[PDB]
């Protein structure tokens, strides 16, 4: 009681500060820009060869190779330019949750319900691709094991703990704590100095890898956070909330600049990503169709279509020349 | 076109990858999976004889393979990791029938499972454990079902009774009352897309695998017939 009141007072002060210095709104200030216009997205290639439903995918650095895994417990390295099985690595555990492609392109990592996302090599000296290091110390499952460089991998577990790992020793170097519920998705910043984590408690935390502490907090949703993507400029980011709504925040403002939602949709989001220019925002849904939102007018430019079942993952190339989506139907699609 | 000589190696790699993936598909389709579930410390690890995400079991039966799954390393929270099991052949639910207090929690968990969106179309096998322990407790009679449940006041054993030697009217009544509660839960809303298969067992039994075999056969037969739209 002597501390709950203090917490309430501090929270009220923070809310008042957020409310202040909020003159006008994004929809009010950007309303004079022309609409992007209806888009004519269509499939320029499809990818087949999986054994079960797909969960996650990721683009390479060269924007030509992408890696994905499925519930079948296999990692497949494709080649969009000329559809080809570059590699096919099956994991020891048939379960998997995420995959990642090292910027150098010489390593990949993935994990599942076994609570250990291990490191996989691709530049084998002898000639055979073999697992390099298995990282143990996390209690829950892993919902993202994003790479940082050839020797550092950021990871977020299902046990409210995220930590940065040093691959060489295979031992945690720093531990992030503070999230109330389960952490689901994380994304790095262009300067690789900060990353954002969304957790299943209607809150996403901003951190600092070098120092290891929460710098800020954001709360604007009515349910858990399913996906999160960083704006290219590094001054904002979007989150995919299960409450059938996508919201955007700004670090400098410390608030929610504008939100996307409509009554037409009653399905929570599954995956979100940004276009290279930033005007287009790619939002997934549960109804097998992936919408495209005008990131600066709150409008919809025309949904995609032509996928069998729930879309699991999504992404865009580094150069932004293509978009890739995965679903539970074991198919992978690539769009113009 | 000399660069195409590397395309030749790429095509060879594709051929090898699909050659292995063919056998992978064959074996994966052949295999059968079973998601185990139940309250911790409810005879789960001992339900099956075992002579044959963390805990998995392979056991052939009359030239058919089964891959049971027991994910028991995580936290109490289940609202997220359960969604990753939308395509299992069937579920095996095991409950310690002797825990009257915990029975309500088990009931609510089962109701949530049944009405879950992504599990709306999976039928669940049902295992009730410690029938002998329940019999001993009820014969002792110090406790009582009437203590925790009011519906036991006016319950009459159904005409479909099927007791065994020793089983008295009282123990039969208790057994079938619990089973009828679970059946009511299942029948509240089924849509015909899934049901439950009640069973009874002790911890020193062996016919379990046969029961799972029969249940799976019946469920798959019904699935095929449904695809025939009758």
């Amino acid at each position, epitope marked *: 009681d002597q501390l709950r009141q203090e917490a309430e007072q501090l929270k009220n002060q923070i809310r008042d500060a957020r409310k202040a210095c909020a003159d006008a709104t994004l929809s009010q200030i950007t309303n004079n820009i022309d609409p992007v216009g209806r888009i004519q997205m269509r499939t320029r290639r499809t990818l087949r060869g999986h054994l079960a439903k797909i969960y996650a995918m990721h683009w390479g650095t060269d924007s030509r190779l992408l890696v994905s895994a499925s519930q079948d417990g296999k990692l497949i390295i494709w080649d969009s330019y000329t559809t080809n099985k570059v590699h096919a690595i099956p994991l020891r555990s048939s379960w998997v949750m995420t995959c990642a492609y090292a910027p150098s392109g010489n390593y990949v990592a993935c994990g599942g319900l076994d609570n250990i996302c291990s490191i996989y090599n691709l530049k084998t000296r002898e000639g055979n691709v073999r697992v390099s290091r298995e990282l143990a110390g996390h209690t829950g499952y892993l919902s993202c094991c994003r790479f940082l460089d050839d020797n550092q991998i950021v990871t977020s577990s299902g046990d409210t703990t995220c930590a940065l790992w040093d691959i060489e020793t295979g031992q945690q170097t720093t531990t992030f704590t503070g999230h*109330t*519920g389960d952490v689901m998705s994380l994304s790095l910043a262009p300067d690789t100095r900060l990353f954002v984590s969304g957790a*299943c*408690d*209607a809150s996403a935390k901003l951190w600092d890898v070098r120092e290891g502490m929460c710098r800020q907090t954001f*709360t*604007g949703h*009515e*349910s*858990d956070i399913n996906a999160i993507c960083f704006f290219p400029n590094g001054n904002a980011f979007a989150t995919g909330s*299960d*409450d059938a709504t996508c919201r955007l925040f700004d670090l400098r403002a410390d608030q929610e600049l504008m939100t996307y939602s409509h009554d037409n949709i*009653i399905c*929570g989001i599954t995956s979100v990503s940004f276009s290279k220019s930033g005007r287009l925002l790619l939002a997934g849904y549960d109804d097998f169709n992936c919408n495209v939102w005008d990131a600066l007018k709150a409008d919809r430019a025309g949904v995609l279509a032509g996928h069998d079942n729930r879309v699991s993952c999504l992404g865009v190339t580094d150069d932004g020349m293509a978009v890739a989506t995965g679903s539970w139907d074991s198919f992978l699609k690539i769009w113009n | 076109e000399d660069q195409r000589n590397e395309e030749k190696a790429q095509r060879e790699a594709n051929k090898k990858i699909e050659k292995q993936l063919q056998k992978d598909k064959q074996v994966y389709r052949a295999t059968h999976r079973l998601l185990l579930l139940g309250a911790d410390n409810s005879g789960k690890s001992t339900i099956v004889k075992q002579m044959r995400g963390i805990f998995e079991t392979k056991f052939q039966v009359d030239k058919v393979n089964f891959h049971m799954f027991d994910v028991g390393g995580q*936290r*109490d*929270e*289940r*609202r997220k990791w359960i969604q990753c099991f939308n395509d299992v052949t069937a579920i095996i639910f095991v409950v310690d029938s002797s825990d009257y207090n915990r029975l*309500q*929690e088990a009931l*609510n968990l089962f109701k*949530s499972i049944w*009405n*879950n*969106r992504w599990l709306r179309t999976i039928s669940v096998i049902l295992f009730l454990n410690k029938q002998d322990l329940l019999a001993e407790k009820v014969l002792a009679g110090k406790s009582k079902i009437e203590d*925790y*449940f*009011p*519906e036991f006041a006016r319950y009459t054993t159904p005409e479909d009774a099927t007791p065994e030697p020793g089983e008295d009217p009282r123990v039969t009544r208790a057994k079938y009352f619990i089973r009828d509660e679970f059946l009511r839960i299942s029948t509240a809303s089924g849509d015909g897309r899934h049901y439950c298969y009640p069973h009874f067992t002790c911890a020193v039994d062996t016919e379990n695998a046969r029961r799972i075999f029969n249940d799976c056969r019946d469920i798959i037969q019904r699935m095929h017939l449904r695809q025939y739209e009758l």
Partner: nanobody
Amino acid sequence: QVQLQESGGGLVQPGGSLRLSCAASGFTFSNYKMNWVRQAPGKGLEWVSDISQSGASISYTGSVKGRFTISRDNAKNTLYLQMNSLKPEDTAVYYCARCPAPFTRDCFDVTSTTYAYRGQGTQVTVSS
């Protein structure tokens, strides 16, 4: 901005009526199904009651059936729970949690001291 405060509660002799309230704040009340939970000393949580979106359908636990009336007032965002004819063994701290997914009927909102959509708390006891 998900906040849940629980009014009502306190001391009362056995068999003496009471009232309780759980007025949410910051989320669409009408789109979720509510729950009431409790935990007596030396025991874990346990489901007690709930209510559908519109209030048409209800449920209850075995012990208190016919003694508590759970009413949901959608417009005022306050969920009542009338307490009637108490018994000495029913003393426990009470909460109020909206299970996560709106527009559904499945809930997993009794996690062991780990759930996040749970109210703060309220105290009710009985004595002579």
